């Protein structure tokens, strides 16, 4: 069962979050620009079976990109960025490092620091969170 | 069964951390005024036995305030401040929510601070960090 963690960003836009709750991450897909524009993933739930979160959380802007995870490659660490956004207080950044310490970097904005490192082997398996037009806040599950 | 997840802090101090794992934390005691001088805790490790952290993890500066805590009756949400004070940085600042409402805040809010909300009956089992004069670092063990 994965502990639930957050969410960091604003209050702004509908709240967002996936059935049966995830134990280990498949794949994650984040859409950005300047900013971060959205946020999906696919994941093996409690149920040991595979879902999708569904339609991408946030809207229609930047470009996509998508990492694949394993038994050997997984997120041990995000980190971000909390600030405006138009009136927005939004993900302004985000980064995300897997177990083989390759780093990907999303948007390029600045703001409040957020930062969760998972040790031991833990890994973050999925997400919640808040999304309109951009990705408004951000939260983990994560599983040992 | 706990997630490990942290550090926050600077990166000094020596590493401090319990065995056997903690799934239950019965009371936790920081040392502060200025700053986060040290913390403590008693906790229920994954070998239903009752064990100590040992002597506190940082100096002999502050004061003691203790909270007592059980399965009903936990620590929720952990936010603080991690900043400079004198040449190290360090933990300035920790306030601890329980499930009950009661609050804590120890130490002063100077620097970036963190936050870590546990949600959906999640709690903050225990801790580890660095520590040496002050409390450098502090990270949770914490289960679903």
Redesign the interface.
């Given at each position: 069962?994965?502990?639930?963690?957050?969410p960091?960003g604003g209050n702004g836009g509908s709240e967002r979050d996936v059935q049966p709750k995830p134990i280990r991450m498949v794949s994650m897909t984040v859409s950005s620009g300047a900013i971060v524009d959205a946020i999906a993933f696919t994941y093996v739930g409690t149920d040991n079976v595979q879902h999708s979160s569904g339609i991408k959380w946030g809207g229609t802007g930047g470009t996509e990109d998508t990492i694949n995870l394993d038994a050997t490659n997984y997120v041990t660490e995000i980190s971000g960025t909390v600030g405006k956004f138009g009136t927005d207080d939004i993900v302004t950044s985000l980064k995300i490092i897997t177990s083989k310490g390759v780093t990907r970097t999303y948007g390029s904005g600045t703001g409040?620091?957020?930062?969760?490192?998972?040790?031991?082997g833990?890994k973050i398996a999925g997400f919640f969170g808040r999304a309109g037009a951009f990705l408004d806040a951000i939260?983990f599950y994560?599983?040992?």
């Open positions: 069962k994965p502990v639930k963690i957050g960091w409040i620091p957020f930062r969760v490192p998972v040790l031991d833990g939260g994560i599983t040992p």
